Design a protein. Structure first.
Ligand SMILES: CCOC(=O)CNCc1ccc(-c2cn[nH]c2-c2c[nH]c(C(=O)N[C@H](CO)c3ccc(F)c(Cl)c3)c2)cc1Cl
Length: 347
């Protein structure tokens, strides 16, 4: 059994010639050669069974990606694990191999407008499929956008994905949140649990702004600082947008702040395409109900060179979890993971 950087990586005999790529909070990804299809792939070893959280994220991703099939969404083509639950200590998921990701590119590469336009299109094309299945990604960011040498884009990491639930999205002021801070919509810190498709659109807007300048637009250092960054550029919310926030603690916090004017997009991004900034403004709308939707975004003039709704497929049916995974012990989650992966065993 070959191992990579002092950690067991038993995936043979089908997959060999391992090579390290990255390491996560509870797993490792390596490139391997597939002896059946005779092509290299990406294998993510997971060791989640010691924490309920890691089990929930694992199961959510497996169930969703086995039902999804889209050029701009990472796939699960095989799953390796022990033949019995007693022997199953880790789980290996075989996925698309991709040379780089948008986080790496932005660190060192200036993106031409054509590249920014093409990246944004694929993101939104993938997101259209996700949202058509009534699913939310909830952690879109450059590091979760993989790319190959011809700049084909695939969205990955569905650990925080959920089924949309707009009727149960309201919550109190300063409610804790898991997803990455720099890409959280302002309503997360005010009165939202992130159960609406509009929180993904905000994240895409942050990604667009980051592609324009090679730096995050709202780099908050802590929870509430994230909101103050957003308000520093968008300016004070209008009376109309404030009235939609019925929670008094949230509204009164906003009312306690000095008046701040809107920072014009053309001053923040002097070299950006004018149509790109118009679409950015619509994705980074303070009011989530006025924020642009994914299909509307794909039809925006900035993407006219690529827009083709007949070549932007949707899911064949909405997604629905068989049971709520928010209150299940790590032990039972291991069973469900064992069941969802049974179809990939040799027997
Ligand atoms: C905590 C996030 O992980 C990191 O440390 C930074 N990502 C580096 C990376 C960069 C590219 C690739 C890669 C290259 N080709 N295919 C993949 C790939 C295949 N699957 C995944 C994936 O699921 N990534 C997510 C994060 O986006 C993930 C989720 C959970 C994890 F434990 C790990 Cl290690 C990774 C990535 C893999 C990796 Cl691990």
């Amino acid at each position: 059994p070959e191992m990579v950087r002092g950690q067991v990586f038993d995936v043979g005999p089908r997959y060999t010639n391992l090579s390290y790529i990255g390491e996560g909070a509870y797993g490792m990804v390596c490139s391997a050669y597939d002896n059946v299809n005779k092509v290299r792939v990406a294998i993510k070893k997971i060791s989640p069974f010691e924490h309920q959280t890691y089990c929930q994220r694992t199961l959510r991703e497996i169930k969703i990606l086995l039902r999804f099939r889209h050029e701009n969404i990472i796939g699960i083509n095989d799953i390796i694990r022990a033949p019995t639950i007693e022997q199953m200590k880790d789980v290996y998921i075989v996925q698309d191999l991709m040379e780089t990701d948008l986080y790496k590119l932005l660190k060192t590469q200036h993106l031409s407008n054509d590249h920014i336009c093409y990246f944004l299109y694929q993101i939104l094309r993938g997101l259209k499929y996700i949202h058509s299945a009534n699913v939310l990604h909830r952690d879109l960011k450059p590091s979760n956008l993989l790319l190959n040498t011809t700049c084909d884009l695939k969205i990955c990491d569905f650990g925080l994905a959920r089924v949309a639930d707009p009727d149960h999205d309201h919550t109190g002021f300063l409610t804790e949140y898991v997803a990455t801070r720099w890409y959280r919509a302002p309503e997360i810190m005010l009165n939202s649990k992130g159960y609406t498709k509009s929180i993904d659109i905000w994240s895409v807007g942050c990604i667009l702004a980051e592609m324009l300048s090679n730096r995050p637009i709202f780099p908050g250092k802590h929870y509430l600082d994230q909101l103050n960054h957003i308000l520093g550029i968008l300016g004070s919310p209008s009376q109309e947008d404030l009235n939609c926030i019925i929670n008094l603690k949230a509204r009164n916090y906003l009312l306690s702040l000095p008046h701040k004017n809107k920072v014009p997009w053309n001053r923040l991004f002097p070299n950006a395409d004018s149509k790109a900034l118009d679409l950015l403004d619509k994705m980074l709308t303070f009011n989530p109900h006025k924020r642009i939707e994914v299909e509307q975004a794909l039809a925006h003039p900035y993407l006219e060179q690529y827009y083709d709704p007949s070549d932007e497929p949707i899911a064949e049916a909405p997604f629905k979890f068989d049971m709520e995974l928010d209150d299940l012990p790590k032990e039972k989650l291991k069973e469900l993971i064992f069941e969802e992966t049974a179809r990939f065993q040799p027997g």
